[PDB]
Design a protein around this ligand. Structure first.
Ligand SMILES: [Mg+2]
Ligand SMILES: [Mg+2]
Ligand SMILES: [Mg+2]
Ligand SMILES: [Mg+2]
Ligand SMILES: [Mg+2]
Ligand SMILES: [Mg+2]
Ligand SMILES: [Mg+2]
Ligand SMILES: [Mg+2]
Ligand SMILES: [Mg+2]
Ligand SMILES: [Mg+2]
Ligand SMILES: [Mg+2]
Ligand SMILES: [Mg+2]
Ligand SMILES: [Mg+2]
Ligand SMILES: [Mg+2]
Ligand SMILES: [Mg+2]
Ligand SMILES: [Mg+2]
Ligand SMILES: [Mg+2]
Ligand SMILES: [Mg+2]
Ligand SMILES: [Mg+2]
Ligand SMILES: [Mg+2]
Ligand SMILES: [Mg+2]
Ligand SMILES: [Mg+2]
Ligand SMILES: [Mg+2]
Ligand SMILES: [Mg+2]
Ligand SMILES: [Mg+2]
Ligand SMILES: [Mg+2]
Ligand SMILES: [Mg+2]
Ligand SMILES: [Mg+2]
Ligand SMILES: [Mg+2]
Ligand SMILES: [Mg+2]
Ligand SMILES: [Mg+2]
Ligand SMILES: [Mg+2]
Ligand SMILES: [Mg+2]
Ligand SMILES: [Mg+2]
Ligand SMILES: [Zn+2]
Lengths: 5, 104, 118, 205
RNA sequence: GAGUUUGACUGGGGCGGUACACCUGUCAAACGGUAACGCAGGUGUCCUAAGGCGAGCUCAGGGAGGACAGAAACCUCCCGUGGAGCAGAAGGGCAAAAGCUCGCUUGAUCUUGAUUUUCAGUACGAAUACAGACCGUGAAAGCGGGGCCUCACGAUCCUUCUGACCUUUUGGGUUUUAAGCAGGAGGUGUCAGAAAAGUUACCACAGGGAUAACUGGCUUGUGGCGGCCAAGCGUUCAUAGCGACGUCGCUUUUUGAUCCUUCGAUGUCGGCUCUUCCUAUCAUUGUGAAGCAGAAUUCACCAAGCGUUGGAUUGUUCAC
RNA sequence: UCUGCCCAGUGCUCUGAAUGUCAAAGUGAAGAAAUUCAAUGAAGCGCGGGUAAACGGCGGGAGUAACUAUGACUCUCUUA
RNA sequence: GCCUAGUGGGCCACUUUUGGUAAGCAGAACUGGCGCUGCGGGAUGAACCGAACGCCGGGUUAAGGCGCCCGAUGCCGACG
RNA sequence: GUCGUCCGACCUGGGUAUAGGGGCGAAAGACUAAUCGAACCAUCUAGUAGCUGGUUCCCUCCAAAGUUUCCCUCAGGAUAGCUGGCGCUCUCCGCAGUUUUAUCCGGUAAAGCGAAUGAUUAGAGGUCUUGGGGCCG
RNA sequence: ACCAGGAUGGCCUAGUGGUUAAGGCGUUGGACUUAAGAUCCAAUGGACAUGUGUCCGCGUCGGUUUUCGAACCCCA
């Protein structure tokens, strides 16, 4: 997925 | 600045103050057979590209003024150089300034 | 750096533009010197307005660059600014000599017009 | 607009007057420091009451104008339109700053001049009113009302002196009589026994 | 097509700026030293004199006079501790001067060492006393080896120039050359001195909570809420309800400020669902007060027990 | 169904002894020679044309019509 | 006199003190601490107060305390 | 499960051709043996790391630094300072994070503005040293 | 907010090194014409945006104000 960017 | 073309000053050959003619010192032509030039040429020949630094980051707007003072006595005629402070405009023997005169 | 080489490229482009500017100024100058009819006088008058005003914008950018402390040798800029001023003062002489009417206050104060060969 | 006075109540910084180093300072809100009969003589308004500070704090120019409006309104209501003389004895000289933040943060956080604020010590007079002796309760209520415009604790003190002078009210009248004080507008001029004798002859002619 | 580079400081980094080499006043707490992207400023120049000596004067400003002439042109007298000037920034210094005007000049020359300043007690730069010459100037005492002082600048390698009946130019000798020795310059301002453009959302590695983007913590400017004082509003009437000019607070449901925890990972907006808590109470219970006649509506108290909805648009919180 | 305007810039291309710069080799001279000086002088840069269905680009401020607006109109600055 | 490791991220407090509205904020001076350090006390606690430490017995203290937790007022404590 | 296409730039087996800064691409930096913004294997190679992690028995004695200056220096060095060890030269006059007696030094706190500079509030007393005006000329 | 600029006749623009106030349009007066434009002969005007410093002297150079326009305000 993708975390806090 | 303005310096005159004649100065009576010390001469190391005469051991005495003598009159001198004053000229601005010019950077001489580079000889091809100075040792550093020969080493530079043979280091730059072939492949490898540039082998010594090339100075770019120029910051001074002014060169230090150097005067060639040459003694006028025909037996001596000795040359030496005297370095004066930096100045943007340099004049040799221009005109002695005058006081209390009208501006035009 | 690329900033300095940028600045230098715009200097060379501007000095080139001043070079063709003075050349075209002296072109239209000698055409007005050879001008035949009145309408030719006012047209090369107007073309000298266009070129000297272009040249005045160019001197304005040159004087901003002379005021800058990012340039170390300014002899090309000072000589180009002198050349621009020379063209400006010549144009000012021509606009005086043409725009003064023959019987205005200036003409009735001092007529003169020495006309050197005459 | 401007911050509440609790931001600049305490004399934390060094004194910072407007000068050639502090420019772009707006004018103080208070401008007039004397109200009532300024032209009243020294024998017309003998009774003087002070509002004396009790803290080492900083009074804003806005507060110094609000208190002089409050005291002026009560004294024109109670003593009548001209029956008093109010002197505000602080002039706002200390400039307070502001670092307005709409980001830079505390980078280059030196303030622009926000306002003018006076510095008062423990025991220094803030406001003084001189008037006739029968207006004493009107003076006390005027300073007590003007107290609420000011932060911190102020006392009301009826002074021992005679109006806006450095001389005591009891010794004042007979030392006027002995020609030691010549009345000169609002206050007096002291005449010592030290000048040339032509001044003594002119005074005792 | 190849190889490489693409400064640093920094209340994260980038943009901005230069606090990167220097100088003044302050900070700076009365020896000295002393920090911040602290404050107000300046520097990379200028001078054949604005260097040096001697002599003569005295400046800024003010008063009073005198044809044109007036506010201001010039002549004169008086007062004049400097309120002028000394190239500049500022500070210090200076009156038969260090200022202004003349006269003569070139100590702004050559050569060792020592010292101060920054300092490691190193260099450079700058400076200080000396000494050895050779000069200038003055009647002489003296003074001068740049500028009244505090600033105005530059290593090695290379180049260039100057100096000596100089050294070497390697088997010997001669001559050109070349290399040395000594003294200036050509310059590195990132100023103890690499030769250097970007982009990466296709990205990679070593690390960092020394360092940002949430929550939490300190703070409360700003946001929000509430007081005190009472000039005024309210036909009157300060205070039913309000409330200017001022001033004191609270809260962390606003944004900031900071960077303490976490970068060998605490899943980053909304909505749906579901439970509970707070009160600064919209409604309902009980009340008090109104410029509360009734009705309606305000303001206030005990009070959070129980409620506070269905939808169009928008991902929205918010909004309507 | 049309495909407007701009060759100033940056590219591309054309022209070349009338030519500013121009390396090596070659040529002239001085010297003992290394060497130095000079004359000549290629392509390319500069110079001059052409090209936008090449890359690309294609303005500002005022006054002005029997209410008021608006601005067909005028003025001016300005570019390729 | 020689050789020399480690260090060259610091942080806190009285008083002085700069920026900031302020901050368990950023920056200096002086001295003392913490870091490097346990112990008695402040319930708890890097830094506050007392005091610095070999392994023990007796005694005594400091700062703190003495209703009960919890050693010590369970004094016929004083004045409000 | 629902779907795109299913006579044509269709689907498919075998053979063959192109190989790593190369191939091949109806173009997504896609594919090239589960590997692709440069495959895989072995070697150079134990590549370098101012950066993380770890670093093995006891007792005794001494005991820090986060500061100076310079550095493409700011997570690092050099240098001084602090430290330890090894001593050594003497002692068994000298010195001191201290006072006293002398003597100089300073411009901070305070204070001042009827003192210079700068800022600034209010009246008062004067005249012509000027001006603005009413009124008599 | 930061950087860079720009403020001059009534409008639109010039203008230095420091001494000259410039041009176009407009306005005004007279000619031409029956008259008006066009055309011809002439004339005036500038808070040089402000104050300060430099200089003998500034619109011009240098710092501070007051109105304006342009570029940037990024990574989460
Ligand atoms: Mg070759
Ligand atoms: Mg402060
Ligand atoms: Mg950095
Ligand atoms: Mg001290
Ligand atoms: Mg003299
Ligand atoms: Mg001597
Ligand atoms: Mg001198
Ligand atoms: Mg080297
Ligand atoms: Mg993309
Ligand atoms: Mg942290
Ligand atoms: Mg608030
Ligand atoms: Mg009323
Ligand atoms: Mg974890
Ligand atoms: Mg997890
Ligand atoms: Mg979790
Ligand atoms: Mg309640
Ligand atoms: Mg087209
Ligand atoms: Mg073209
Ligand atoms: Mg484009
Ligand atoms: Mg701190
Ligand atoms: Mg910190
Ligand atoms: Mg540690
Ligand atoms: Mg210790
Ligand atoms: Mg301890
Ligand atoms: Mg406790
Ligand atoms: Mg204590
Ligand atoms: Mg015991
Ligand atoms: Mg207890
Ligand atoms: Mg395919
Ligand atoms: Mg792509
Ligand atoms: Mg590092
Ligand atoms: Mg580490
Ligand atoms: Mg001091
Ligand atoms: Mg004081
Ligand atoms: Zn000689």
């Amino acid at each position: 997925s993708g975390l806090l960017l | 600045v303005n310096v005159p073309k004649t100065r009576r000053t010390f001469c190391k050959k005469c051991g005495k103050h003598q009159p001198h003619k004053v000229t601005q010192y010019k950077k001489g032509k580079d000889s091809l057979y100075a040792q550093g030039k020969r080493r530079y040429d043979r280091k730059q020949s072939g492949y490898g590209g540039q082998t010594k630094p090339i100075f770019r980051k120029k910051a001074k707007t002014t060169k230090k003024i150097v005067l060639r003072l040459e003694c006028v006595e025909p037996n001596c005629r000795s040359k030496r150089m005297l370095a004066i402070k930096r100045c943007k405009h340099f004049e040799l023997g221009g005109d002695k300034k005058r006081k209390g005169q009208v501006i035009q | 750096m690329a900033d300095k080489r940028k600045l230098q490229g715009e200097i060379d482009r501007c000095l080139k533009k001043v070079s063709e500017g003075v050349e075209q100024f002296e072109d239209i100058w000698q055409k007005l010197h050879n001008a035949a009819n009145a309408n030719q006088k006012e047209k090369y008058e107007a073309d000298l307005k266009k070129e000297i005003k272009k040249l005045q914008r160019l001197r304005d950018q040159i004087k901003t660059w002379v005021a800058s402390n990012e340039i170390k040798d300014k002899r090309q800029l000072i000589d180009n600014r002198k050349l621009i001023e020379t063209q400006m003062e010549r144009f000012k002489v021509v606009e005086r000599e043409t725009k003064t009417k023959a019987y205005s206050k200036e003409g009735l104060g001092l007529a003169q017009k020495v006309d050197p060969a005459q | 607009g401007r911050r509440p006075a609790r931001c600049y109540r305490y004399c934390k910084n060094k004194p910072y007057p407007k000068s050639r180093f502090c420019r772009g300072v707006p004018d103080a809100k208070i401008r007039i420091f004397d109200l009532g009969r300024k032209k009243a003589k020294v024998d017309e308004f003998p009774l003087c009451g002070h509002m004396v500070s009790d803290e080492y704090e900083q009074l804003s120019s806005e507060a110094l104008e609000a208190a002089r409006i409050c005291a002026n309104k009560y004294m024109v209501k109670s003593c009548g339109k001209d029956g008093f003389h109010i002197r505000v004895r602080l002039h706002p000289f200390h400039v307070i700053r502001i670092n307005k933040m709409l980001q830079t943060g505390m980078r280059g956080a030196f303030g622009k001049p926000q306002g003018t604020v006076a510095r008062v010590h423990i025991g220094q007079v803030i406001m003084s009113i001189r008037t006739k002796l029968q207006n004493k309760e009107h003076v006390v209520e005027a300073l007590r009302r003007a107290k609420f415009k000011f932060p911190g604790r102020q006392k009301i003190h009826i002074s021992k002196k005679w109006g806006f002078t450095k001389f005591n009210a009891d010794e004042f009248e007979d030392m006027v009589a002995e020609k030691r004080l010549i009345p000169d507008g609002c206050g007096v001029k002291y005449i010592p026994n030290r000048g040339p004798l032509d001044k003594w002859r002119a005074l005792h002619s």
